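Newbie here. four chains, one complex. Structure please?
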Amino acid sequence: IQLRREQVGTKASDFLEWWVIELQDCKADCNLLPMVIFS
Amino acid sequence: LAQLLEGRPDQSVVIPHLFPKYIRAPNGPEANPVKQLQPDEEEDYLGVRIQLRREQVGTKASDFLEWWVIELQDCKADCNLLPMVIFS
Amino acid sequence: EELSQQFDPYPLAMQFISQYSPEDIVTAQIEGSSGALWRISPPSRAQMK
Amino acid sequence: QELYNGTADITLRFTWNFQRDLAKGGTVEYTNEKHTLELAPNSTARRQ
């Protein structure tokens, strides 16, 4: 995971943050994570 | 949408008749718009428009905090209270 | 009576409106403004922009 | 303060979930299951 703060805790409130998911060792899933299901 | 997403509280949108007004909500798993009171399947369904409002508290676009206001493509009073009609 | 009026010259619409009971159709109202903000990642806001 | 110095364990639920269509049939619609991971008091991932 990656936590990203974008400046707009007081300073931690002026920064506004979210999360970006990836693999433990990402190859291209840092842009588009996959998952496979079978039904 | 580009004039909306520029971060300016003036502009608007045009919708080529996406929003229907009379929707059959069946006794089944899938609701469908009525094809009889609205017989045109792309045009009988009315038009919408949106307004993006930014209130100053992108860095400036983060200091501004924004939301959306819905209305008709040509609103009469639904810019205060939009209607929708369903039959079951 | 309005649904009797508002759909005059369409006979399929006439039969559809006269089909149901009076208490089978409702009219939802929706507030024009949002009840919240467009809370979105500024990366995603930039990508949609 | 839990991730800093809360001297106990902490769970993370990864929750996948799917929903099919209904006119295809099927008498249940919102299928899912959780999955748990456990992190120690002041562990390496806790420090991350």
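Moderator note: The first helix of chain C runs from residue 2 to 5. The beta strands of chain C are 25-31. Thread marked as resolved.
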